[PDB]
Amino acid sequence: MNIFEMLRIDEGLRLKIYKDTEGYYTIGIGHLLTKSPSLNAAKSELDKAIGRNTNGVITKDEAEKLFNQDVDAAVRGILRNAKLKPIYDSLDAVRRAALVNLVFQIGETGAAGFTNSLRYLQQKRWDEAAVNFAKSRWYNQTPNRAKRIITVFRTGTWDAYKNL
Ligand SMILES: [Cl-]
Ligand SMILES: [Cl-]
Ligand SMILES: [K+]
């Protein structure tokens, strides 16, 4: 198990433009195209992203290319965010992956907004962090996924992704 396999489990893989849990145009492995309700606008972002005139459908290889970029970007951003870097540095590799996952899903801003939960993580108060994380729109809108992430933050093990 690793960040790529983990996010591949959580985001799935679709080669045609689809809408994410929030209703936004996405493709590949959770690659958000735009928040716009315009399909054309999403298609234009996709073409820009891939570098070719696509027609809304991409190859697996292309999808993975975007995904690698996305993961890398998620990590890069964590490292440039003063609210998150210290948390990230304080964690072991498995818990860091959970944090990357969260940021990939909700964005840096959204993630850095979990100030109190992050602080408990920093203090290594596992169970308390877990309880706290659940008190959020994030958890309520995507409870299955949030549960998984939370268990990883709580235990520092990949058990929750074992079997998916
Ligand atoms: Cl991009
Ligand atoms: Cl979910
Ligand atoms: K998805």
mmCIF file of N, CA and C and ligand atoms in Angstrom, residues 7 9-14 18-21 26-31 104 145, ligand 3:
data_model
loop_
_atom_site.group_PDB
_atom_site.id
_atom_site.type_symbol
_atom_site.label_atom_id
_atom_site.label_comp_id
_atom_site.label_asym_id
_atom_site.label_seq_id
_atom_site.Cartn_x
_atom_site.Cartn_y
_atom_site.Cartn_z
ATOM 1 N N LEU A 7 -4.929 6.437 -3.121
ATOM 2 C CA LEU A 7 -5.788 7.383 -3.824
ATOM 3 C C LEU A 7 -6.447 6.712 -5.016
ATOM 4 N N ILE A 9 -7.584 3.798 -4.985
ATOM 5 C CA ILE A 9 -8.726 3.134 -4.423
ATOM 6 C C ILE A 9 -9.830 4.150 -4.162
ATOM 7 N N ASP A 10 -9.476 5.257 -3.538
ATOM 8 C CA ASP A 10 -10.465 6.262 -3.192
ATOM 9 C C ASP A 10 -11.069 7.025 -4.372
ATOM 10 N N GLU A 11 -10.322 7.248 -5.432
ATOM 11 C CA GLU A 11 -10.855 8.058 -6.523
ATOM 12 C C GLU A 11 -11.372 7.266 -7.709
ATOM 13 N N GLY A 12 -10.932 6.036 -7.855
ATOM 14 C CA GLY A 12 -11.312 5.203 -8.968
ATOM 15 C C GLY A 12 -10.571 5.674 -10.233
ATOM 16 N N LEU A 13 -10.981 5.148 -11.389
ATOM 17 C CA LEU A 13 -10.348 5.550 -12.645
ATOM 18 C C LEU A 13 -11.435 5.577 -13.730
ATOM 19 N N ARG A 14 -11.637 6.771 -14.325
ATOM 20 C CA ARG A 14 -12.632 6.943 -15.373
ATOM 21 C C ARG A 14 -11.955 7.748 -16.462
ATOM 22 N N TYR A 18 -16.475 13.012 -16.047
ATOM 23 C CA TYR A 18 -17.626 12.625 -15.210
ATOM 24 C C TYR A 18 -17.770 13.677 -14.101
ATOM 25 N N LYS A 19 -18.756 13.552 -13.202
ATOM 26 C CA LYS A 19 -18.853 14.523 -12.144
ATOM 27 C C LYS A 19 -18.456 13.874 -10.827
ATOM 28 N N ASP A 20 -17.695 14.614 -10.036
ATOM 29 C CA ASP A 20 -17.220 14.113 -8.785
ATOM 30 C C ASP A 20 -18.311 14.142 -7.712
ATOM 31 N N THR A 21 -17.957 13.824 -6.462
ATOM 32 C CA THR A 21 -19.012 13.786 -5.423
ATOM 33 C C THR A 21 -19.720 15.090 -5.142
ATOM 34 N N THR A 26 -14.687 16.173 -13.669
ATOM 35 C CA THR A 26 -13.435 15.521 -13.329
ATOM 36 C C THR A 26 -13.164 14.439 -14.335
ATOM 37 N N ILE A 27 -11.933 13.932 -14.366
ATOM 38 C CA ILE A 27 -11.582 12.825 -15.230
ATOM 39 C C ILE A 27 -10.405 12.068 -14.581
ATOM 40 N N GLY A 28 -10.099 10.901 -15.121
ATOM 41 C CA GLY A 28 -8.927 10.186 -14.655
ATOM 42 C C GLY A 28 -9.124 9.686 -13.256
ATOM 43 N N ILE A 29 -8.065 9.892 -12.499
ATOM 44 C CA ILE A 29 -8.055 9.442 -11.127
ATOM 45 C C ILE A 29 -8.274 10.660 -10.260
ATOM 46 N N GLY A 30 -9.514 11.155 -10.232
ATOM 47 C CA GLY A 30 -9.816 12.305 -9.381
ATOM 48 C C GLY A 30 -9.216 13.596 -9.863
ATOM 49 N N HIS A 31 -8.977 13.731 -11.152
ATOM 50 C CA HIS A 31 -8.418 14.982 -11.598
ATOM 51 C C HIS A 31 -9.544 15.982 -11.851
ATOM 52 N N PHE A 104 -5.408 16.164 -1.363
ATOM 53 C CA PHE A 104 -5.766 15.941 -2.752
ATOM 54 C C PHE A 104 -7.280 16.077 -2.926
ATOM 55 N N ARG A 145 -15.282 7.220 2.850
ATOM 56 C CA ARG A 145 -13.904 7.590 2.594
ATOM 57 C C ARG A 145 -13.257 8.220 3.827
HETATM 58 K K K B 3 -13.494 10.365 -8.063
#
